[PDB]
Design an enzyme around this catalytic site. Structure first.
Site, short mmCIF file in Angstrom:
data_model
loop_
_atom_site.label_atom_id
_atom_site.label_comp_id
_atom_site.label_asym_id
_atom_site.label_seq_id
_atom_site.Cartn_x
_atom_site.Cartn_y
_atom_site.Cartn_z
N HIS A 357 0.86 -1.19 0.00
CA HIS A 357 0.00 0.00 0.00
C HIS A 357 0.89 1.24 0.00
CE1 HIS A 357 -3.62 -2.29 1.98
NE2 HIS A 357 -3.47 -2.58 0.70
N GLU A 461 17.67 0.38 -0.97
CA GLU A 461 17.16 1.07 -2.16
C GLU A 461 18.05 2.23 -2.58
OE1 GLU A 461 13.52 3.21 -1.57
OE2 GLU A 461 13.96 3.63 0.52
CA CA Z 1 12.01 4.34 1.28
#
Ligand code: CA
Ligand code: CL
Ligand code: MG
Length: 662
Positions: A357, A461
């Protein structure tokens, strides 16, 4: 008034001789926190500041233990002395409040308790006067990230003189010239604004509460308490790590039987989008397809992973998804993502779909769909959901009761309440929550054990596109700062480090391969991702075996050695659960940009038992820039009387499974 840790080494003196109530703290009879103010200012109510006097102290103590449903250790010991100090000011503009202090051998917690009293009705705190006045701040060294910046908690750590840390997030960690390590944080952040630390006069860090867009900090009706303010104090850096003070200051589990919360490992349709081999939005390279998900589920079932995260499954990602917060659907999948078929396939393979989400910061669009979204996931046998709140600092978007958009901070009272609503609603559906772009961890997983992990720091990331990526020292910084708050979903385990080219000037994890393995023991999280593309694990099966073996739930954890921004060594004993007997120990160690030799005693191993150490370490010539993959895997029989010499390459690491025999 005075209260001391059970061992007497930490001593807190609470005073009313200064302008306001104040406290100071000594460690081994040396002042480490000077006189520090206490109190409040309000928007309209008269302040709680000067002319309050101590009228009463109430002493008690605790010597107990409790068991975690899951965690970095099974049994948590709570031993502290406690004092409640009551302050009163005569009318006019009088009042009364109390501060409760708890003194542990590893640190101090305190909170205000403001009782019901005449004239204390609807109030709005505009300032919390709480200070942390560090003694000898001019010779102290701090490792910190800035607060109120556009990138929220996602910054690399600065190493500076303490007097240079102007406005910082917590956990805020530093050492004084004596070598004493201190870390300031908070616990049980509920219906209140997060604390940022604002250095005023040199060394005097004042609480700076993250406000509503209207400008006030905290709305309350009548009597209220604050969260706990925590001050960890230790002789060594690892004494900060090995404390349970944050968990011990939270309220016991409110969710009853939480056996439906399942620690484990997962993979995901995820990294491909971060390195641009797939897209979140629809088209030729769409990551979240039925076919792709089944392929990941097959891999997970074969190699021992409990679930597959899939991002980009729901409509709204097309275009520039950073800007799409208003249009996300949390119930309608793209036409190429067949939820019914994947629900069937999840039951067939035994691999869970892990939900996702992303709000892109629009929490009102999410809130209006949240019940339908969790109903769909419950109907679809989805047990864990990763949430996301991608937006710049201060740019959460809410729609108020009159339909007017407002911008809020991720860490103001509004969002603090918004995150907990999401976690509580998920619990009614037997769903656990992994929050990216979160409020910092303040130990609430004790009270709500389905709030299993969060990001709230730069994770893997940023190694795909950070420009620059995380530096070699990053893990050894997180271990003594971010990780003091609680578990982190770092998504470790990148095996192909070369997708952008090797060297020191490309976007990639600036680590060796063995360091990627060590992360599974160095960085605690009840769920651990194997973040890479499946084919990259198939290319390195021997290294992959460590990820297949390592648990994520521990009976005991011990940071054996370390120094902030340089290295850390963790040993952890697996918790008996599912696949794991509870007899194996694991170790992980990482360094910063320097190659490092670390001597380790194995006396944490169970006495009288024989183990086979399965050692994954940097090869002789490994170095992260152009030779990160050199790797040695060795099996060696060991017992508690043995020792090891860790040889870590530049931005290197070592991971060990100690397999109990017989
Ligand atoms: Ca993040
Ligand atoms: Cl990193
Ligand atoms: Mg260093």
């Amino acid at each position: 008034a005075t209260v001391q840790s059970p061992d007497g080494n930490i001593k807190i003196i609470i005073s009313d001789e200064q302008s306001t109530p104040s406290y100071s703290i000594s460690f081994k009879n040396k002042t480490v926190i000077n006189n520090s103010a206490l109190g409040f200012e309000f928007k309209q109510h008269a302040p709680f500041s000067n002319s309050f006097k101590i009228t009463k102290v109430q002493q008690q103590s605790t010597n107990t233990q409790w068991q975690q449903p899951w965690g970095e250790r099974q049994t948590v010991v709570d031993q502290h002395n406690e004092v409640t100090v009551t302050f009163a000011k005569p009318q006019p503009q009088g009042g009364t409040y109390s501060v409760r202090f708890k003194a542990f051998d590893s640190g101090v917690g305190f909170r205000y308790e403001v009782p019901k009293q005449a004239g204390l009705n609807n109030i709005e705190i505009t300032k919390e006067l709480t200070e942390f006045a560090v003694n000898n701040s001019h010779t102290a060294t701090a490792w910190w990230i800035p607060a109120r910046g556009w990138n929220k908690y996602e910054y690399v750590y600065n190493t500076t003189p303490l007097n240079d840390a102007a406005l910082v997030h917590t956990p805020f960690t530093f050492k004084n010239q004596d070598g004493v390590h201190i870390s300031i944080h908070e616990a049980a952040l509920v219906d209140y604004a997060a604390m940022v630390l604002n250095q005023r006069r040199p060394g005097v860090f004042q609480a700076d509460l993250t406000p509503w867009s209207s400008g006030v900090a905290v709305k309350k009706q009548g009597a209220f308490n604050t969260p706990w303010r925590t001050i960890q104090i230790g002789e060594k850096a690892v004494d900060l790590v090995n404390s349970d003070i944050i968990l011990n200051l939270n309220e016991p589990n409110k969710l009853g039987d939480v056996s439906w919360v399942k620690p484990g490992k997962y993979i995901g349709i995820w990294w491909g989008m971060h390195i641009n081999t797939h897209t979140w939005g629809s088209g030729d390279k769409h990551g979240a397809t039925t076919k792709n998900t089944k392929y990941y589920m097959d891999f997970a079932a074969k190699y021992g992973f409990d679930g597959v995260l899939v991002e980009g499954w729901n409509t709204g990602w097309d275009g520039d998804w950073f800007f799409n917060g208003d249009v996300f659907s949390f119930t309608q999948p793209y036409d190429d993502f067949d939820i019914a078929a994947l629900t069937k396939y999840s039951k067939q393979t035994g691999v869970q779909l892990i939900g996702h989400h992303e709000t892109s910061g629009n929490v009102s669009n999410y809130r209006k769909q949240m019940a339908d979204a969790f109903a769909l996931y419950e109907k679809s046998n989805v047990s864990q959901v990763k949430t996301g709140y991608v937006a710049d600092g201060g740019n959460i978007k809410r729609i108020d009761k009159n339909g007017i958009a407002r911008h809020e901070w991720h860490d103001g009272q509004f969002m603090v309440n918004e995150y907990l609503h999401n976690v509580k609603l998920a619990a009614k559906h037997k769903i656990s929550i992994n929050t990216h772009e979160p409020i910092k961890d303040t130990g609430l997983r004790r009270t709500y054990p389905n709030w299993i992990t969060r990001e709230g720091a730069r994770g893997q990331e940023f190694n795909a596109w950070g420009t620059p990526p995380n530096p070699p020292e990053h893990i050894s910084m997180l271990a003594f700062t971010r990780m003091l708050a609680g578990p982190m979903d770092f998504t470790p385990g990148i095996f192909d480090l070369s997708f952008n080219g090797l060297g020191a000037n490309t976007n990639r994890p600036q680590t060796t391969l063995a360091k990627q393995l060590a992360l599974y023991v160095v960085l605690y999280s009840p769920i651990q991702m194997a973040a890479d593309l499946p084919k990259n694990y198939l290319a390195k099966p021997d290294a992959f075996q460590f990820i297949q073996d390592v648990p994520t739930d521990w009976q005991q954890s011990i940071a054996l050695d370390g120094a902030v921004g340089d290295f850390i060594v963790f040993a952890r004993k697996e918790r008996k659960r599912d696949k794991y007997t509870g007899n194996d120990w694991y170790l992980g160690a990482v360094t910063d940009e320097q190659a490092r030799t670390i001597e380790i005693s194995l006396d944490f191993l169970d006495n009288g038992k024989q183990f086979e150490a399965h050692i994954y370490k940097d090869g002789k010539n490994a170095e992260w820039k152009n030779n990160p993959y050199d790797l040695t895997i060795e099996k060696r029989l060991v017992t508690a009387s043995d020792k090891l010499t860790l040889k870590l390459a530049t931005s290197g690491g070592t991971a060990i499974r100690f397999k109990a025999l017989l």
